Every structure is written in C-alpha cells, then in structure tokens.
Amino acid sequence: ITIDVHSRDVVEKFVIQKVSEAESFAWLSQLKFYWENKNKCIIRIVDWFRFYSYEYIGNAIRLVITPLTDRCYITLTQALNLTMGGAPAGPAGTGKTETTKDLGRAIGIPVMVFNCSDQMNKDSMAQIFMGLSQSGAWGCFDEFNRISIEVLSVVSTQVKCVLDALKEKKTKFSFEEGEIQLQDTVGFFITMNPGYAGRTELPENLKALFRSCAMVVPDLALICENMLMSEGFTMARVLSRKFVSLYMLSRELLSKQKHYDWGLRAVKSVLRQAGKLKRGDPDMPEDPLLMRALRDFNMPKIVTDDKVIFRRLIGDLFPKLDPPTKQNPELKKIVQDTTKKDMGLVAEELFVTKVVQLAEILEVRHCCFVIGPPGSGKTCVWKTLIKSYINSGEDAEYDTLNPKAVTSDELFGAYTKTKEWKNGVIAVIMKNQVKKATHMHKWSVLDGDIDPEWIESLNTVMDDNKVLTLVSNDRIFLTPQMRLIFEISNLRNATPATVSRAGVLFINETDIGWMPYMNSWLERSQINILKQQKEMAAKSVFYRCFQSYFEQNIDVHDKNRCPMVDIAMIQTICTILDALLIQHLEAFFIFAGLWAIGGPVGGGQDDSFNTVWKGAAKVKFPEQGLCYDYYYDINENKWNTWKVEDYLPNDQPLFSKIYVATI
C-alpha cells in the first residue's frame, strides 16, 4: 500500500501537469526494470543499469517516501554512476541511519553499518576492507566523529587508492602486500554528525573524496491509515488524514507543559485499542468510538479551559456526533458503596469520578502517573479502588516502594567484594509474586521524586515489553496481573521518553473535597480497624463559625500577604483538631484558630493582622495593646491574662539557665 499510494501520488502529479512526453522526466526519476534470458537479469535507473543480486532480503517493515528521500535516492544512484561513495549527513536522529539500510537492501545487497569503535587499528580497518572488497559487500562506519586521525589517514588512502583501482576497472591489486582479485559490486557510504560535540575532524582530501547530503525531516500518517485500513472497515484514509491533522494541530496549539505529550507508542496504542473495540459494534458506532477514544486521553491530561478549546476544535470535525457516553454505573455504585459505608471514609461523586478514571486507565495500561500531595485524597482514591477491586475480583497482592528511600545499587543488587552477588528488592518482590498464588492480582506503587538513573534502569518494563534485566544475568517477564503505579508531585526532572512510557493523570488541588472531609472528622472519627487507637473527643455551632470565618479570614490574610513560609490550609485544620481537643480539656475555638493562623506572621505586620481580625471578631478584643493577650479561663469565665517565674536553683549549672516564663 505504501508503494501503491506513492505510484498514486505520482500519477496525480502527471494528471495535474498534463505531462506529454513519453520520456517524461519526473517519470524517469523513478525505477526501471527488465528481464532477460541469459543467467543474469538487469535493473535500470535514470542512468545506472547493472545485474541483480538475487539476494533474500527477508520481508521487513519499510519506510515512506519523501522529497528528501527522492534527493537521497538520486544522490546514491549518481555516486554509484561515478564510482565514488557518498557522505550524507545532518543532525543526529534524522532517520538517515534507517534510510541508509533501507536504500541498501532496496536492491537487496549487504549493508554492514558499524560503529567506529575502540581506536580501530589501521590493521583492523585493512582486514575489514580486504574482506569486503573480495566479498562484494557494502556498508558504512557510523560515528566517524570518533576515530584517531591516524586511522583516518590510513583508511582515507586505502579508500582513495582502492577507488582509483576500481575506476581503472582492474582485476587484481595489492594493498599492504595483499595482491588479491577484486569484486565488481562494492559500495561504501559514510555518515557523521556535524559540529555539535568535540569530535575528530575530517581530513581535507578525505572530505574531498566524497560529497555530502544534508537531511532533516521524517513523518507518520501511512502507518495509521494502514492499520485503520487493516482493522476491518474501509473508510479510513481521510480518517487518518483527520487524525494526523488533529495530532499536529494539537501539538502546535496546546500550551507547552512538561507532562504534555502525545507519545508515539501511546498513539499506536490508541489506534489498535480502537481496532479491537470495533468488534461487536455496527458501522455507525465506528465514528463515535473514535471521538470517545480521543476523549479517553483528553480527560485525565488536559486542564478545563484547554479541554473546552480542544473539544470545540474536535466538534468541528464531526459536529453531529457529540453525545456518546460511558457506561459503567455498576462499578460506579460498587465504588460508591465502598467509599460511603464500608470504608467509614467520606464519599463524593467527584472522588468516585477520579476513581473511575483511574480504574479505566489501569485497565488500559499497566501503570500511569498522578500529581498531588500525600494523604490528600488520591492515596485514598487508589485504596478505595483496590478495595472495590477486591469486591469485584478475587484479591490484590500489593506492594509499596520509594526510589529515593535507598540507593539504586542496593535496589538492584551488586557484587560483594569477594565477588559475591547480592540481589535487589524488586527481584524479591517479583519472585514472591510470580511464585504466593494465582488467586490474586499483583500491584506495586512507587512514591517519591524523579531521578533519571533508576527510572531508566527499568525501561525494560516501562517499554512495550514487561521484562527485566539483572546484573547476575537474570531476566524475568510478567503476566498482565502485575501492574505498576507511579505517584509524583512534580516532574521537575523528567525525560520525554519516560513521559511517553506510561499514562498520565492530574488533580487540580482545589478538587479535594473540603466540607465533607471536615464534617466527617467533626461527626465521627475513623473506625478503629487496627487495635489500640489514641484518645479522641453543638457541632453546628463550631461548623457555622468555621464557615463564616472561612471566606472572611481568607480575604483578610489575602490582603495581609503575611506569612514567613508557604503553607496549605489542610494542616491548618489538622491544628484546628488540636484546637478542638484543647477546648475539650466558641471563644476558645476562636482563640486557638487565631493561634494556628498567626504562626508564620511577621513582626511589623503584627500590626496589620490580628488587628483586622479583632475588627472582624465577634468578641471585641479588650486588650487594645498587643491583643494577643488571650488566656481565657474556663471555670471563672474571665477574659484574659498572663504569668511568670524565675530563681537560682533554676540557674545553678552552666547550662539550664531559667529563661524566665517569657510571654
């Protein structure tokens, strides 16, 4: 189909130009072939024409044509025509390394692409050349950038005098006494990366030996359209055009964020999952599945405003096919029951929504990412998810890990000097997991930060394959029952490959349910599943008081800021719990909330402050000067005061001076 659509494109060029001459020249650019009844056949190009190799290339996956590749095709055909090699080059990772091999095996000849590795002896290069010459092989020695220019002279002059011999079209010639016959079909091509790093430079006459070919562009579209083709339905070419258009325009339009990625393997994934998903659905549901699958990644990745933008951008493509939907009310209500009553935790439709997104993402791929602080709802989200998972399934073997807790070397094992091999920890985990029992599903979590070395150490599972490597020559693969979970708070030090490996999930920190949380803590402490809990002690009074204080003091300290250090508002309620307990030991609620909020506040701004607070406070502060005077007495119900003490046996030793009962 690749070569079919290429022939197609050229025929459209012909019909658009209304090409007239039979010797048409945009036509003579491409390949020509003819048979014969000699022993030996022939090929033909614009000018070059020689015998065929009759070599078994083996069926392999093959790249796409592009005007750059037309340029390169023609460069190579003429270099062949001239009896001199070519030196294509350009930026690294351009695709030229694949194009060299593609072009070599196009006619079906050997392509030995090597690395200029470990100070290649002039001898070693001489023997490689001696073998290749009489064998009639072809190749390239990539990474010419690293070679002693010692070997560069040796090999440049080998190449140039061998080139002169082959141009003479001799039969036998000698090099370092190697008077040997030659082979006709021989081809060298060279490719290096220009001035980016410090590397050995090219000799002048050796850079004159060859000419070069700059290269910079690749592309997709064909593979998508080809698999949408091969899925089971037909109308897929313009479909893939829409897909790739949406993809590149999303790249351009959507704001640059570090986690923002459209990973190539995730693309191929979305494609063939939709491929499976067609099964059992008529011709109409084909198109709804497309947008719903695009949404299957649109949801847990994109913020609300870019979501609105993107969804309108999509609804342009098919404006009559907006309302498909998801159908999982069964798992909805399972996780709802769990969160609501079985846990004793507080439930919320929003929390359950995140649980459902996490569940379907875990169903899709083995692992994913998630952004949030610990104990901030998301850990309880995956906990309620695994508990609903044991309600809807057999069991869940589960493990917890942290990369930066220990070093990577003991995390993966190393030798004990005395050469004794020691193991890692994930090896033990996977050993017990694959070897426990089957009536379980195996999960592990990784919480911490991002450091490239340990996460790339296990790319062998983060890639499409789920398989391991060990220093002790051990390789372990896993059944889909083994899943990973990646918690993170910031991706300050991530890599695009690591981003493309797994999924993604984001939590706007405003989504953490506040009022249900605080109402739960006010009404009932968590159920004492574990033994030996700690001591814990109308409610509407303090609830309404906190609610009224909420927005007013928020705006108050919003004007003020001023704190010494950045803080969230959750640990503030964690201290409001201490406030409630010291009350158990309204006015006291106010005073202890004041003591909690006034922590990081600065001196000169202490006269902003509590000042605007006693403005906003129910009980008028009688302490007009330094209103922080509040030791209210429960029994006598007086208003406020302080106290002090100091003496000599308190000051006996060098240390333990009685720093007096300062205020």
């Binding site: 829409k242 258009s245 325009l249 351009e252 309108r312 951008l313 342009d316 493509l317 404006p319």
Partner: protein
C-alpha cells in the same frame, strides 16, 4: 493567527482545518466574519505601488514598508482573494535576522512568471530597527 482561526471557526461554526487564511492588502471581507487590520510588516527585495508589485534597485533600500494590510479566512479551497497564478508565495522569517527557519510563506502578486521573482529572492520581515 490560529486564535483568529479559532474565533472565526466558532463564529461561522465551521471546521478549523476548513479555515484557509488568505492575505488581503486592501480591506476586509464579511465569508470571513472578521478582517484584521494588523501592523508591523515590511517587504524586502521588491517595491510596490497601488495594485502593482515593483522591484527594488541599488539606491532603493532592500526594505519596502508594506501598505496598510488586512486579512480574511475561507472554506478549504473556495474562490479566495486572488488567483493562484496571479498570486505567488514569498518567505516569512522572524525579523531582521534571517535565522530560525521561516515560519511560513505568504502570497503576493507576481507581475511576470515568478522566475524573476524567485531570482529576486523576495521575502518579508516583521521588524527592522
């Protein structure tokens, strides 16, 4: 530009990929619900008079400030502003510095076959000095 693709997409309720931008040196149109009178454009390599593209010379500077421009968008391949042969693309880089791989190429009238206009190496700069 893509934002004005976006707003005009929603105003006419059309597709994005449908929207084809086209320059309009004279004024605005109304398939395109909006036509922007934008500033900061200077031609290079060729002069211009009212409805005519001239060619710079030695004494004329390499720069030629373009007339007040306007723009419009359209359906994919409808009858747009000017004729494809009458029009002709010219590169659009960033600014005075020719670095950074031209953002796109904009249409401009060719008085004769673009051959001489290619030979002229015309272009447009966003800002100089």
């Amino acid at each position: 530009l893509t934002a004005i693709m976006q707003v005009i997409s929603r105003a006419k309720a059309y597709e994005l990929n449908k929207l084809y931008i086209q320059t309009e040196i004279t004024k605005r149109s109304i398939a395109a619900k909006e036509g922007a009178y934008v500033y900061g454009f200077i031609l290079e390599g060729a002069r211009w008079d009212y409805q005519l593209g001239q060619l710079e010379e030695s004494k004329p500077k390499e720069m030629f400030s373009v007339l007040p421009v306007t723009y419009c968008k359209a359906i994919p391949l409808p009858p747009e502003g000017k004729e494809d042969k009458s029009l002709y693309q010219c590169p659009v880089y960033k600014t005075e510095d020719r670095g950074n791989t031209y953002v796109f190429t904009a249409q401009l009238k060719t008085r004769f076959p673009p051959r001489k206009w290619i030979l002229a190496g015309v272009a447009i700069i966003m800002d100089v000095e």
